[PDB]
Design a protein around this ligand. Structure first.
Ligand SMILES: N#Cc1c(-c2ccc3ccn(Cc4ccc(CN5CCCC5)cc4)c3c2)n[nH]c1N
Ligand SMILES: N#Cc1c(-c2ccc3ccn(Cc4ccc(CN5CCCC5)cc4)c3c2)n[nH]c1N
Lengths: 213, 202
């Protein structure tokens, strides 16, 4: 039973998550995902969420007063606050496993150059906070990272969404555009098949991810 | 100028996506059955997407100039270097798998005609290629013409809940500010991503 709250200035971006949630899991109270527009917590008629960086430099920084109010309303002491950032600890499958047993995740999606650091620092004095990155590339903001995190975590929660590299997979037809499925797979020698797959995995890992070796 | 075509059995998922155009195609539009997947040869759990439907879709969508991108957990890593490389391409086609993935012959056949890249966006498991497509598109499109971890950023007010913006950032001394920011970045990189500086991962 997990609740996920996402806070963002682009709530429409989180539409796919709601699209991918089976009715059965929601009706069984296994999961609830809520998306909140950050501008609900702005102070001014112009609904301002950003401001110039101290110390100068390019871009803008999201305002701590707006984020502080939003998180004050949404979080509790039991919340795991997740903050996507290109400067974060790596989000991995181990992370996803750990978070799949949480009661309450709140994902704070930044834009511009990110969120004033005092927001996370203040939150960390009364709840668990995790600054994480989903990969070594640069995005426009936290929303795409939130989609990835939500999917990776929820697929590990029983009945919610419906090392070496894996080798190639094949299905019907047995021959297609001049390429035959590897005969060993049709041999009925299941120890040999397992050994073939293991060697394929080993070779692919060497070629594509030698860092794992 | 870049064109991006995404092929998926879940077009609705791609909704978050004139120098660039993005088009989303339902893979089932290329079926003749009143089924896109079947059980794996050699056995194993789950289902595999059949090559037949993919071949027909890609025949119609791709040319020999196309870069065919195939998200897969067993892919080469997609990094910022990859994003720079792809940013000057004329035509990206992203083939999004579901179930246990796509029959390997799809990528193998395509590679006789065009350039093919099997890539992974990170070391975690998704339910299919769509979320990876969204990440790849976002990372690439922000680089289309027309190291160290970043340190912390701050903005107004200079004191908030009794927490002060680091005084150096208020000082106006460009040299001391640059130095402090370099130190913060160093500290953050050592703590969070020591591999980037050639140290062992924790
Ligand atoms: N997870 C995750 C992420 C994100 C991510 C997550 C959250 C936000 C909020 C805003 N942005 C955009 C941005 C863009 C450029 C810079 C400048 N830096 C200078 C050197 C590098 C970046 C800073 C922020 C975000 C990006 N990007 N990549 C990931 N794996
Ligand atoms: N990029 C990227 C990706 C993906 C991704 C990309 C494309 C597809 C198409 C289908 N799936 C789902 C899937 C899930 C698990 C397995 C492994 N098997 C499970 C049981 C035994 C092995 C195979 C496929 C995909 C996942 N995941 N993580 C990334 N960084």
């Amino acid at each position: 039973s997990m609740k996920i709250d996402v806070v963002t200035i682009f709530p429409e971006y989180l539409q796919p998550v709601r699209q991918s949630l089976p009715g059965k899991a929601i009706d069984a109270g296994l999961v609830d995902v809520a998306v909140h527009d950050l501008r609900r917590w702005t102070h001014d008629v112009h609904k301002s969420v950003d401001d110039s960086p101290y110390g100068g430099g390019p871009g803008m920084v999201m305002k701590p007063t707006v984020w502080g109010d939003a998180l004050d309303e949404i979080c509790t002491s039991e919340t795991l606050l997740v903050v996507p950032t290109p400067a974060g600890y790596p989000f991995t499958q181990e992370t996803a496993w750990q978070w799949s047993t949480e009661d309450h995740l709140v994902i704070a999606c930044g834009r511009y150059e990110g969120i004033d650091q005092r927001v996370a620092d203040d939150a960390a004095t009364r709840m668990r906070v995790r600054e994480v990155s989903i990969g070594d590339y640069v995005l426009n903001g936290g929303e795409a990272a939130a989609l990835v995190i939500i999917e990776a975590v929820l697929r590990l929660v029983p009945g919610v969404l419906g090392s070496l590299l894996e080798g190639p997979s094949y299905t019907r037809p047995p021959s297609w555009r001049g390429m035959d499925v590897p005969p060993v797979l049709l041999s009925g020698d299941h120890a040999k098949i397992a050994a073939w797959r293991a060697e394929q995995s080993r070779q692919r890992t060497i070629e594509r991810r030698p860092d794992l070796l």
